[PDB]
Design a protein around this ligand. Structure first.
Ligand SMILES: OC[C@H]1O[C@@H](S[C@@H]2[C@@H](O)[C@H](O)O[C@H](CO)[C@H]2O)[C@H](O)[C@@H](O)[C@@H]1O
Ligand SMILES: *[C@@H]1O[C@H](CO)[C@@H](O)[C@H](O)[C@H]1NC(C)=O
Ligand SMILES: *[C@@H]1O[C@H](CO)[C@@H](O)[C@H](O)[C@H]1NC(C)=O
Ligand SMILES: *[C@@H]1O[C@H](CO)[C@@H](O)[C@H](O)[C@H]1NC(C)=O
Length: 606
């Protein structure tokens, strides 16, 4: 279709499938295996990307060009990698992935949204769609085209360190929140075939339903462990939201480190090929988790030849190596050369990877748009995060007796008020894991508003606000305070570091609540990724709010505390009486919760 040097796959007017087949037909084995290889930016250089025909890069948690990097710095980094990839013989652009799981959270100045558990509390799928829309803009602000989200785990045991990444223990809630996908990617057209990948264009990103499948069902909530459940239970609890994701055109699916009845997901042909590809008709690409294939074996990485064979034969398309690319490429090349892995399997993997790239417009817009840089941390997106934080809050108690005056909403005008606790003025703590660093961090790690700052921004000018992180009982009794807001809870964590068999918040937390509430009426704001042992906190407190991990916009908390809006959040998980009960989920035979799934007190706006 026209000039003498015409190349069909480079023609933007041609159908995606024709472009895919045209390109695939021209590729060497090296070029094919290259597409299947995703590497960390930490090991990438122009020569590496060119010489190995690399298909993808990622930033893992905390993998950044430098701390405090601007959006333009990120764009320049990604574009530098892309220029190298576009200089190959075939000029196949790389796709760059990142964990943008509650905003573009590795990036300084990015809006940080509430984590998924709090979003489940909102029961507001359209809110979550809007969060996806805002997240896509902030990801593209940094030049990145691919977000490793949503996590559609159905966390069945809050001892899991990733429970906060699950919208709910109830698969119906998780299904509803798959609206994140068309937020990130754009809405699919009316005609759309379930299982096809979709991204609308350069202002949207590819999404990733993860981690397939049963990541939330592991024994005792042990991260990456074994999910022991029959097929009926897997299909009833852990699988449904993957079908919703297919219906919404999710572009990629990431495989879980976990096992199902002792079979590693990264080696499970029956589920990856038989079910996801052949039954759900998924036509996007399947990606490993980080060193996921290494962890097929015990010890991890002890037979990488086997890891490569098992994973590629199981049906994975792209391997998040992410560091030992030469070994990966060498081993896979050897397996193909030896007939151990057929060319049909390689061609399928590359077909899927190319399909996603062509579909999303990556060949037409391989480089960043400098005009998008200003999307990062945009006030409109912060306003959305503030709305989400407020809606996520679950009011658990509002008065010690049925006859007391309800404490909340608090008055904005009072002579003197106390703000206290380890979590009252700690932005990193209110964001939790996957914020700037992989595991999160403490203190003023990004741009945002702490609970203390939010209180100061909310109150009447005549109201004196005193901050004391851990005041003693005498300080409070002598202080002349009208009331106190005390914020405590969990420290940031991610993945296995968050696995926790006791679910008791660190001290000082309870001691501070007891000291404060003993001296003045108190509203306790509990920051956590999950239900934690709460009876002692409740006993001390006049009012108590489960605020989850609300993100950068602390004013969402004060919007409800001071009555600008009513409390509306409802528990998206069971609140247990004790950890000895676990696992214990809504619908179980011997269900004995402290607060049932769906529980939440309300207030009316002042
Ligand atoms: O970052 C890519 C994927 O990685 C793993 S987390 C990974 C971790 O396993 C590794 O030890 O450290 C990396 C960098 O700190 C993490 O990104 C997670 O399981 C996925 O959810 C995530 O999408
Ligand atoms: C589960 O965890 C135990 C204890 O660390 C470990 O020995 C076992 O191999 C794990 N099982 C799986 C399937 O990951
Ligand atoms: C609870 O477990 C966590 C994580 O395993 C640990 O850091 C903490 O010390 C434990 N707390 C108690 C009270 O045992
Ligand atoms: C809140 O409004 C509802 C609905 O009108 C009402 O039933 C309830 O009594 C109100 N509570 C307060 C404290 O105003």
């Amino acid at each position: 279709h026209h000039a003498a040097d015409y190349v069909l796959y480079k023609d933007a007017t041609k159908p995606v499938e024709d472009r895919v087949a045209d390109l695939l037909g021209r590729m060497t084995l090296a070029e094919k295996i290259g597409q299947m290889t995703q590497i960390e930016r930490l090991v990438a250089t122009p020569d590496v990307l060119r010489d190995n025909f690399i298909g993808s890069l990622l930033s893992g948690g905390g993998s950044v060009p430098r701390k405090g990097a601007t959006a333009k710095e990120w764009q320049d980094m990604v574009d530098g990698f892309q220029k190298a990839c576009m200089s190959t013989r075939l000029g196949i652009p790389m796709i760059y992935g990142i964990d943008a799981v509650h905003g573009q959270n590795n990036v300084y100045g990015a809006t940080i949204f509430p984590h998924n558990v709090g979003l489940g509390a909102t029961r507001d799928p359209y809110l979550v769609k809007r969060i996806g829309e805002a997240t896509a803009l902030e990801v593209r602000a940094t030049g990145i085209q691919y977000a490793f989200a949503p996590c559609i785990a159905v966390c069945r045991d809050p001892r899991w360190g990733r429970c906060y990444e699950s919208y709910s223990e109830d698969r119906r809630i998780v299904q509803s929140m798959t609206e994140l996908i068309p937020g990130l990617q754009g809405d699919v057209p009316k005609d759309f075939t379930s299982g096809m990948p979709f991204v609308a264009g350069k202002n949207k990103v590819a999404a990733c339903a993860k981690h397939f499948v049963g990541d939330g069902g592991t024994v005792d909530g042990i991260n990456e462990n074994n999910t022991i459940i029959n097929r009926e239970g897997l299909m009833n609890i852990h699988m449904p939201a993957y079908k919703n994701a297919m219906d919404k055109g999710v572009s990629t699916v990431m495989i879980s480190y976990s096992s199902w009845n002792g079979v590693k997901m990264h080696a499970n042909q029956d589920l990856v090929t038989g079910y996801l590809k052949d039954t759900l008709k998924f036509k996007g690409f399947v990606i490993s988790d980080f060193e996921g294939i290494d962890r097929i074996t015990t010890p991890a990485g002890s037979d990488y030849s086997y890891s490569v064979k098992a994973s590629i034969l199981a049906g994975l398309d792209m391997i998040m190596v992410p560091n030992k690319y030469q070994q990966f490429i060498s081993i896979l090349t050897g397996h193909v050369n030896g007939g151990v892995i057929p060319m049909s399997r390689i061609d399928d993997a590359v077909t899927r990877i190319l399909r996603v790239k062509f579909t999303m417009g990556l060949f037409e817009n391989p480089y960043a748009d400098p005009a998008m840089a200003e999307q990062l941390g945009k006030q409109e997106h912060r306003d959305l995060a503030r709305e989400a934080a407020r809606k996520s809050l679950v009011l658990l108690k509002n008065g010690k007796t049925s006859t007391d005056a309800p404490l909340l909403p608090l008055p904005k005008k009072a002579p003197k008020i106390l703000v206290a606790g380890s979590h009252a003025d700690n932005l990193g703590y209110q964001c939790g894991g996957w914020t700037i660093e992989w595991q999160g961090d403490t203190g003023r790690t990004t741009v945002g508003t702490t609970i203390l700052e939010a209180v100061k921004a909310a109150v009447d000018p005549s109201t004196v606000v005193v901050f004391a992180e851990n005041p003693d009982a005498e300080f409070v009794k002598s202080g002349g305070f009208s009331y106190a807001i005390v914020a405590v809870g969990e420290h940031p964590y991610t993945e296995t570091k968050g696995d926790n068999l006791n679910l008791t918040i660190p001290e000082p937390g309870l001691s501070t609540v007891q000291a404060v509430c003993g001296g003045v009426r108190c509203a306790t704001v509990l920051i956590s990724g999950r239900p934690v042992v709460v009876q002692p906190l409740l006993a001390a407190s006049d009012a108590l709010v489960a605020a989850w991990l609300p993100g950068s916009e602390g004013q969402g908390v004060t919007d409800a505390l001071f009555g600008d809006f009513g409390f509306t959040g409802r528990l998206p998980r069971t609140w247990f009486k004790s950890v000895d009960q676990l696992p214990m989920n809504v619908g179980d035979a011997h269900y004995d919760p402290l607060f049932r799934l769906g529980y939440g007190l309300t207030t009316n706006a002042t």
